[PDB]
Design an enzyme around this catalytic site. Sequence first.
Site, PDB file in Angstrom:
ATOM      1  N   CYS A  39      -7.520   2.187   9.080  1.00  0.00           N
ATOM      2  CA  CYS A  39      -6.105   1.855   9.069  1.00  0.00           C
ATOM      3  C   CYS A  39      -5.406   2.347  10.329  1.00  0.00           C
ATOM      4  O   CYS A  39      -5.294   3.557  10.554  1.00  0.00           O
ATOM      5  CB  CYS A  39      -5.421   2.447   7.827  1.00  0.00           C
ATOM      6  SG  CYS A  39      -3.604   2.191   7.798  1.00  0.00           S
TER       7      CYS A  39
ATOM      8  N   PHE B 167      -8.102   5.094   3.849  1.00  0.00           N
ATOM      9  CA  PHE B 167      -7.682   4.312   5.008  1.00  0.00           C
ATOM     10  C   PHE B 167      -8.853   3.629   5.705  1.00  0.00           C
ATOM     11  O   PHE B 167      -8.752   3.273   6.887  1.00  0.00           O
ATOM     12  CB  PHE B 167      -6.900   5.196   5.979  1.00  0.00           C
ATOM     13  CG  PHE B 167      -5.594   5.709   5.393  1.00  0.00           C
ATOM     14  CD1 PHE B 167      -4.479   4.886   5.322  1.00  0.00           C
ATOM     15  CD2 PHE B 167      -5.504   7.000   4.900  1.00  0.00           C
ATOM     16  CE1 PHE B 167      -3.278   5.350   4.762  1.00  0.00           C
ATOM     17  CE2 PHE B 167      -4.324   7.473   4.347  1.00  0.00           C
ATOM     18  CZ  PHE B 167      -3.203   6.647   4.286  1.00  0.00           C
TER      19      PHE B 167
ATOM     20  N   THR C 215       0.834  -1.194   0.000  1.00  0.00           N
ATOM     21  CA  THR C 215       0.000   0.000   0.000  1.00  0.00           C
ATOM     22  C   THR C 215       0.867   1.241   0.000  1.00  0.00           C
ATOM     23  O   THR C 215       0.656   2.162  -0.795  1.00  0.00           O
ATOM     24  CB  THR C 215      -0.906   0.011   1.234  1.00  0.00           C
ATOM     25  OG1 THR C 215      -0.093  -0.191   2.394  1.00  0.00           O
ATOM     26  CG2 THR C 215      -1.972  -1.077   1.155  1.00  0.00           C
TER      27      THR C 215
HETATM   28  C1  HEM Z   1      -0.848   4.217   1.818  1.00  0.00           C
HETATM   29  C2  HEM Z   1      -0.693   3.213   2.681  1.00  0.00           C
HETATM   30  C3  HEM Z   1      -1.876   2.451   3.334  1.00  0.00           C
HETATM   31  C4  HEM Z   1      -3.154   2.351   2.934  1.00  0.00           C
HETATM   32  C5  HEM Z   1      -3.836   2.982   1.694  1.00  0.00           C
HETATM   33  C6  HEM Z   1      -3.859   1.521   3.894  1.00  0.00           C
HETATM   34  C7  HEM Z   1      -5.198   1.176   3.833  1.00  0.00           C
HETATM   35  C8  HEM Z   1      -5.938   0.474   4.759  1.00  0.00           C
HETATM   36  C9  HEM Z   1      -7.351   0.181   4.678  1.00  0.00           C
HETATM   37  C10 HEM Z   1      -8.287   0.598   3.533  1.00  0.00           C
HETATM   38  C11 HEM Z   1      -7.702  -0.511   5.780  1.00  0.00           C
HETATM   39  C12 HEM Z   1      -9.115  -1.047   6.111  1.00  0.00           C
HETATM   40  C13 HEM Z   1      -9.271  -2.428   5.476  1.00  0.00           C
HETATM   41  C14 HEM Z   1     -10.635  -3.018   5.775  1.00  0.00           C
HETATM   42  O1  HEM Z   1     -11.528  -2.278   6.239  1.00  0.00           O
HETATM   43  O2  HEM Z   1     -10.859  -4.224   5.493  1.00  0.00           O
HETATM   44  C15 HEM Z   1      -6.512  -0.690   6.584  1.00  0.00           C
HETATM   45  C16 HEM Z   1      -6.420  -1.346   7.788  1.00  0.00           C
HETATM   46  C17 HEM Z   1      -5.247  -1.653   8.439  1.00  0.00           C
HETATM   47  N1  HEM Z   1      -3.989  -1.229   8.076  1.00  0.00           N
HETATM   48 FE1  HEM Z   1      -3.517   0.063   6.540  1.00  0.00          FE
HETATM   49  N2  HEM Z   1      -2.959   1.137   4.850  1.00  0.00           N
HETATM   50  C18 HEM Z   1      -1.736   1.682   4.556  1.00  0.00           C
HETATM   51  C19 HEM Z   1      -0.588   1.519   5.304  1.00  0.00           C
HETATM   52  C20 HEM Z   1      -0.476   0.708   6.417  1.00  0.00           C
HETATM   53  C21 HEM Z   1       0.704   0.514   7.236  1.00  0.00           C
HETATM   54  C22 HEM Z   1       2.073   1.175   6.948  1.00  0.00           C
HETATM   55  C23 HEM Z   1       0.382  -0.348   8.222  1.00  0.00           C
HETATM   56  C24 HEM Z   1       1.234  -0.908   9.381  1.00  0.00           C
HETATM   57  C25 HEM Z   1       2.354  -0.336   9.809  1.00  0.00           C
HETATM   58  C26 HEM Z   1      -1.013  -0.691   8.074  1.00  0.00           C
HETATM   59  C27 HEM Z   1      -1.708  -1.533   8.911  1.00  0.00           C
HETATM   60  C28 HEM Z   1      -3.072  -1.741   8.958  1.00  0.00           C
HETATM   61  C29 HEM Z   1      -3.794  -2.529   9.935  1.00  0.00           C
HETATM   62  C30 HEM Z   1      -3.138  -3.298  11.112  1.00  0.00           C
HETATM   63  C31 HEM Z   1      -5.102  -2.485   9.614  1.00  0.00           C
HETATM   64  C32 HEM Z   1      -6.279  -3.153  10.351  1.00  0.00           C
HETATM   65  C33 HEM Z   1      -6.688  -2.249  11.514  1.00  0.00           C
HETATM   66  C34 HEM Z   1      -7.862  -2.812  12.272  1.00  0.00           C
HETATM   67  O3  HEM Z   1      -8.831  -3.290  11.619  1.00  0.00           O
HETATM   68  O4  HEM Z   1      -7.811  -2.790  13.532  1.00  0.00           O
HETATM   69  N3  HEM Z   1      -1.507  -0.029   6.967  1.00  0.00           N
HETATM   70  N4  HEM Z   1      -5.461  -0.072   5.936  1.00  0.00           N
END
Ligand code: HEM
Lengths: 448, 448
Positions: free
Chosen positions: A393, A386, A261
């Site tokens: 996120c 996010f 991502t």
């Molecule tokens: C541009 C970069 C990123 C984008 C566009 C992004 C996007 C997203 C999105 C759309 C979700 C929700 C997914 C869902 O609802 O099924 C999510 C959840 C999550 N992301 Fe990111 N992410 C990015 C970077 C990161 C980074 C760098 C990390 C970790 C260091 C990360 C860790 C997580 C985690 C652990 C979740 C789940 C949180 C939860 O449900 O408690 N992401 N992300």
Amino acid sequence: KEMPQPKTFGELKNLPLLNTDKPVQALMKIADELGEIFKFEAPGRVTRYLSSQRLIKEACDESRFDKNLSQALKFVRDFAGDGLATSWTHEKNWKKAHNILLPSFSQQAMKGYHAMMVDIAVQLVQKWERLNADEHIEVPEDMTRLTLDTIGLCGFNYRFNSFYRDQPHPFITSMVRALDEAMNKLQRPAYDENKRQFQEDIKVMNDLVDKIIADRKASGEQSDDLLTHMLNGKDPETGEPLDDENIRYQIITFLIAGHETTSGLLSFALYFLVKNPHVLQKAAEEAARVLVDPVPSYKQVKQLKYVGMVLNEALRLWPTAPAFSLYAKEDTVLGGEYPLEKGDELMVLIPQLHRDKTIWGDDVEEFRPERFENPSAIPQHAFKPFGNGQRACIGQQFALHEATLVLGMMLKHFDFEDHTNYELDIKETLTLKPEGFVVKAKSKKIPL
Amino acid sequence: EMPQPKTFGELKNLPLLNTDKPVQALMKIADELGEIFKFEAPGRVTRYLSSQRLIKEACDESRFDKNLSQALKFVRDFAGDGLATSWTHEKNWKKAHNILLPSFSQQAMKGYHAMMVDIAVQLVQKWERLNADEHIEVPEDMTRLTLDTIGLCGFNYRFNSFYRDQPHPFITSMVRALDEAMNKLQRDPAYDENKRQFQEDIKVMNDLVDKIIADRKASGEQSDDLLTHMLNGKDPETGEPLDDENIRYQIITFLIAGHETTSGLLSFALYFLVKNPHVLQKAAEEAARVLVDPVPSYKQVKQLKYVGMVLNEALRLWPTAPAFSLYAKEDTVLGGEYPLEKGDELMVLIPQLHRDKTIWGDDVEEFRPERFENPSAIPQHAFKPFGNGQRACIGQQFALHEATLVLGMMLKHFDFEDHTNYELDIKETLTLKPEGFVVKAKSKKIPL
Ligand code: HEM
Ligand code: HEM
């Protein structure tokens, strides 16, 4: 009232529509034809793709909808376990890890990760300073080296040393192949090698991560990484810490959820910048004015205001985690005309949402970071790169800090040339990236 | 070594509070001196805390307990051992706390909702009945709303403030009692008229409240008010009910603690909305989409998410109960550099806490409700408009449900004009309010 639906294939219904190399872009074209909502049926599965801010602002009502595990996330769960991204809201380990991990992902916690992010960012800059004349840069490949190494360092103090390699660290090869197998399962005795390879790649990931956890517990050393916070943290609610198995899944999750991502974001941002030289010049001017020291400080990254708008506009056009899934907690009516039963599923097609002309105007396809001058002028739930709510996120501040730092340093240190007049070609995995995007960099000869 | 503002000979720092705007004066001192400064007076030493770093320790209940500031000790002369002016170790605090907590829960707001609507409709009807180019005196009408709402929800009594220019005599005595209490802080044979009036105002409050309690017990009638709950409630721990004298003090306490804190919140929120038209438009859209019935329901109020964000951001900039006081339970060291002995007092300067750039970023003075879009992002003890721990505001859910309901209806029924380009002028009593804030309202002609 009657909900649009794309063309069907007899008993397979809509499913063969996703048997394609670019399914997100295929779904966007269907949304272009059918509008803000369409039903997508397959054997044993019905979901509804939402594309308008009007309907998605209701879908983001957490009293009415909760996060659903898409089929993609269910297949990723086979190696991400009950890490944060692949667990249900109602699973005990979700709220536990959520409560424990939120303070280590705050904006304030980025001050502590900053030195390690700078470490990898300088390696990227030095690589480009050391290229010979008329050599060029493979942008997503180098961005992925940067984000994988940064998360390895900030996550569990481990150096993948991706910039010393052509062939990645075995963990990365296994992870990449595991994600591929997970994605190949969607469009899917000859699979016996795939399953054997899949169990084999899972063991590689588990073995390395479990070893580092065991090594860390045996040593007792304290680092500025997520692993230390997780070995020492206690959930305020239950009073419990994460067990070692879940800590492993969180680490694997950070690598899965974060690396591609974030690297795709940097890759799309540089692409849009070189295709829009006025915007690039404005971003480069900010980088030169703000990054006055040989090494960026945490405070200076926060001052890269226009770079941040650049990244948000790249996320608008090409959100690199391009969808998320929801289910209705109870019977409810969407938009005043689409009744849903408890359990009914929704997919939020983020790239379509971000092209809603009723929100952004008629120039939705133009790259204009100025759209983000004031977040108050943007309607509710129009911009969701996010995700949403308590299932949004957790690494958002991490990703934006990393991307802003790295893009800032790139813009300070190099002029960029789109030497091939690159034609955008978006490869789809679980994420989106500009495949084959290449540039030449001419150094400004500013020392580090 | 602890910073300290300028001194006045034997009076030390005390004359610094001899001003009409002492909270704002202390904020300026905190701006100059930093996260902590000593404030000395004859026979008094306290220390004002402004940083999240130090306040998160002061909020450790194992180390610090609530102290009665000099303001609260003066209010105690008519609020008695009601909840807000009693020590934690006094039997009547825990007793009333246990009895009253269930009647202030979020679930308990369902029972107050109808009475709150009754007064809110009176407010809307007053403004619907204004003539053209007549205007609204905002804190005056907000105060009429909150006093009458607390009167009805508290003990089923109608102050009928919207039928009056001069308030009900109880309100006049109460306001004058609070004014005498605050004037005693900044304070001779000439004060003989002041105490005689203070005792007269105390008697006015006691007589009306004691009469209503006596009338209710004689009747035996049951209402949806706090008075009914207090006549019937028994503390699970001691097994005792509140006696009639303490019930009186709780009722007086609700009126003191609740009416102007809450009306100041509503007034500040409307001020920020008319100064930030993009925010107002977003809040007005939500109100029109959510409040689909002529009378708002309890469930609809909970759905006014962005209205809630507006209120939190208004509470961030101008917390209307702007400080609370603590004492060290034992000898302790604050922040790794300030040793305190048992009994030493601390003051938490809430508006400064809410401007701590280390938590909120550099834009602390901007009104951006989007900060509260996800409550997960707020660090622990960074946002304390309702105080701390077991001594936090018991009426928090009441105040926010009232404010959300009323602001929602205001935004549903009217467009607002800042026809004077009002210049913020913050009047200080025991609370904070924007003095002279006036608007014009143009009805949207939506029936009730
Ligand atoms: C541009 C970069 C990123 C984008 C566009 C992004 C996007 C997203 C999105 C759309 C979700 C929700 C997914 C869902 O609802 O099924 C999510 C959840 C999550 N992301 Fe990111 N992410 C990015 C970077 C990161 C980074 C760098 C990390 C970790 C260091 C990360 C860790 C997580 C985690 C652990 C979740 C789940 C949180 C939860 O449900 O408690 N992401 N992300
Ligand atoms: C926006 C409106 C309000 C704000 C900002 C506010 C703020 C506060 C604060 C900061 C405290 C702690 C004071 C201290 O530690 O010395 C407190 C306590 C208290 N408040 Fe509120 N308040 C509000 C509305 C109300 C309402 C509507 C009621 C009653 C219906 C109420 C009743 C009380 C009581 C009884 C206490 C003392 C609780 C205890 O110590 O057991 N307040 N409030």
